[PDB]
Amino acid sequence: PTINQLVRKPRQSKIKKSDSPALNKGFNSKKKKFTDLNSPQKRGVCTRVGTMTPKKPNSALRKYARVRLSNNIEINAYIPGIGHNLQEHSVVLVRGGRVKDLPGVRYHIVRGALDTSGVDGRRQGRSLYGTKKPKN
Amino acid sequence: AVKIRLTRLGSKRNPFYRIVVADARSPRDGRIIEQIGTYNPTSANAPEIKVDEALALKWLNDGAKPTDTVHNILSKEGIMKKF
Amino acid sequence: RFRGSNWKKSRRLGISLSGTGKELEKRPYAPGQHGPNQRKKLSEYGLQLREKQKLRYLYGMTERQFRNTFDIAGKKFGVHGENFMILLASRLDAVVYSLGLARTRRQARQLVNHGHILVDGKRVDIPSYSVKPGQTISVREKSQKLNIIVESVEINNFVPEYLNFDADSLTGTFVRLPERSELPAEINEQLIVEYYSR
């Protein structure tokens, strides 16, 4: 803890990397290179539906979504809830980041969000997987 | 070339203004070096005319004359016509 | 004002704390979903949120609108804990809230709907004001008082200091901001405005 060589030679900070690096980004075609944006809002347009089986910690069954973002790369999602949207090819409002217990996926759906409304079997949630005009 | 200016931070509810010596080719708002004070031309806020223009009335023989319909404020005074 | 319904609030808050109440036409013990069971135990955060159960029903001391004078005069005099409890009831909606002209808790704020308009100032038919040294809720502009507010001229006397009703206006505003005594009993100071700063 000696200060001579401290202006001769400095120190570092910690070492951390931020969250969702292949997110918060809008891929170019005119100038071909991405934008570092951290946008509030964004879209999702669909390529498949997707589902993998081996689930230990829950040990029930539920699928997810394989939705591609701009212009030739693998981007993957998951539908956290009791609502099955047996759909695809949508145009939505993204939710950024991952919910607990799925590795590598960081992209999601807001309730409603211009494509569908949601799993309409919900009426008590009034704020989960599709819930609009709910008597409070 | 010299003209009058004013300051701006946040109030009105009565036509207010200020006294200063800015440039000619510019708007009502201008930079002020020797702050002399402000001016209240709302005929209601008499306690706001604390302008001590000491370097603004020294343009009499330097370069100044009533312009832009502002002679009414100088009409009450008479520190000119020295030539 | 109300924002719902209240009078189950015997076991939610303490009480509105400046009246008689609508507490016990029934079993007033169990607060919610405990009817065949024990009481509610103690904490600080259970304590803190009990405090603010007896702040947001006590008055219309709504969050994100009231702590503000606490931090505002956090540059003015004294550890602001009891300053707050005398900074949420040192208004003309409080120098006239203990004045006893209301029968709904909203009618000390609604003392001026068409009641007390111009307290040396401009007609203001509102709940609150800026109750500085000697600041009332005084007589109406083109009226004086109404049959829903002047119907309780001194509906209870001995209304606090700085609420010294010189009547037919139904308000008293003797001196200044009020010494926080003549207000809720079982309340504290470091559990009014020392729970909020975190």
């Binding site: 200060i3 001579n4 401290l6 202006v7 | - | -």
Partner: protein
């Protein structure tokens, strides 16, 4: 508003008065506070005189009257 008495020492020189004086000062950085001493180089000039092998002198900030050189002052300590 006058002109200082900037001083220093000398290092080397080339044909027909490519003269110079050293510049230095007492001061520190804003970050990690040590009394480390520091310098930068200057540009004075003579006929050929104020030069290498001992010219502890003064310098000036005036009109240079010079190519990119800047100084006219020599106020000395001594010679070798």
């Amino acid at each position: 508003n006058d002109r200082k008495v900037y001083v220093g020492k000398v290092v080397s020189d080339k044909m027909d008065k490519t003269i110079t004086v050293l510049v230095e000062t007492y001061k520190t950085h804003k970050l990690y506070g040590k009394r480390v001493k520091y310098s930068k180089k200057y540009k004075t000039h003579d006929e050929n005189n104020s030069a290498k092998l001992g010219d502890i002198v003064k310098i000036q900030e005036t009109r240079p009257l010079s190519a990119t050189k800047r100084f006219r002052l020599v106020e000395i300590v001594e010679e070798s």
